């Protein structure tokens, strides 16, 4: 009867996108779960979008700040690209200060160590001299897909959420020549994320998905 | 014969929808008709969407 597949290798590149395998799988399987993973990937996977951002002189998104080189509509989009991963708290509030001359990076933000910001070079902003000064509350949650701003004090400034670590999915089907049995494919799934998702994490995450979507009639 | 005037600026953010017409440089329009979800598009040998 059928072979049953498994995690047998999680082949790290980089730190954001990964390469696991699945065998062994039978004749015609490798794809069906190669393209049944990859959806479910791209379409839900939990992620920690930024989804409010205060800054202390900013009313609205469509001014400026002395001393930031950027509008705070960039400021925005800036955020609205940063990657970062919350383990215990659905909800947190990060904070930023940040005073002098460079460039506001991810690193700038307050520790807070039960949130880990994955690349701590992703600039923010920049400031241009040394009595400007930034200090602002970034709101990050957890969710899923893509929930933009509109759907969902006058100071508060909502940036669209992206709550997908996932950011590109390739399904490869080779043939494993193992167990003393030919034409036995293998599924390997290389898999581009933001970092802030284990990629064995993910694909659990996936077949937990099409498992429970799939036991209505079963 | 007015009083006075108080004009508001309102600053409005059109992202996209089907029927806003987009076209290229060589007299090709279209309407989108649907923003279809990225896992629904074609993709290469390297997995990227379209």
Redesign the interface.
């Known amino acids: 009867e059928f072979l049953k597949p498994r995690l047998v290798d999680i082949e790290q590149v980089s730190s954001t996108h990964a390469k696991v395998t699945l065998e062994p799988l039978e004749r015609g399987f490798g794809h069906t779960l190669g393209n049944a993973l990859?959806?479910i990937l791209?379409?839900s996977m939990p992620g920690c979008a930024v989804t409010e951002v205060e800054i202390d002189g900013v009313l609205?998104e469509?001014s400026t700040k002395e001393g930031v080189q950027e509008d705070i509509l960039e400021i925005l989009l800036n955020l609205k690209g940063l990657a970062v991963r919350v383990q215990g708290k659905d909800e947190v509030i990060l904070t930023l200060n940040k005073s002098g001359i460079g460039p506001v990076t991810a690193a700038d933000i307050t520790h807070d160590g039960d949130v880990e910001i994955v690349k701590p070079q992703h600039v923010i902003c920049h400031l241009t001299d040394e009595n400007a000064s930034i200090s602002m509350r970034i709101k990050v949650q957890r969710g899923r897909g893509y929930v933009?701003a509109?759907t969902r004090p006058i100071g508060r400034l909502l940036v669209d959420a992206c709550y997908s670590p996932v950011e590109?999915?390739?399904?490869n089907v080779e043939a494993a020549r193992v167990e003393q049995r030919t034409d036995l494919d293998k599924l390997v799934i290389?898999m581009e994320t933001n970092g802030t998702i284990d990629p064995e994490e993910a694909i659990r995450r996936a077949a937990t998905i099409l498992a429970e979507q799939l036991e209505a009639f079963v | 014969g007015v009083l006075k005037i108080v004009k508001v600026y309102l600053a409005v953010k059109r992202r996209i929808q089907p029927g806003d017409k987009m076209a290229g440089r060589h007299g090709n329009k279209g309407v989108i008709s649907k923003i279809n979800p990225i896992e629904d598009m074609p993709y290469d040998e390297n997995g990227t969407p379209v």
């Open positions: 990859r959806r791209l379409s609205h469509y933009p509109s590109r999915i390739a399904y290389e």
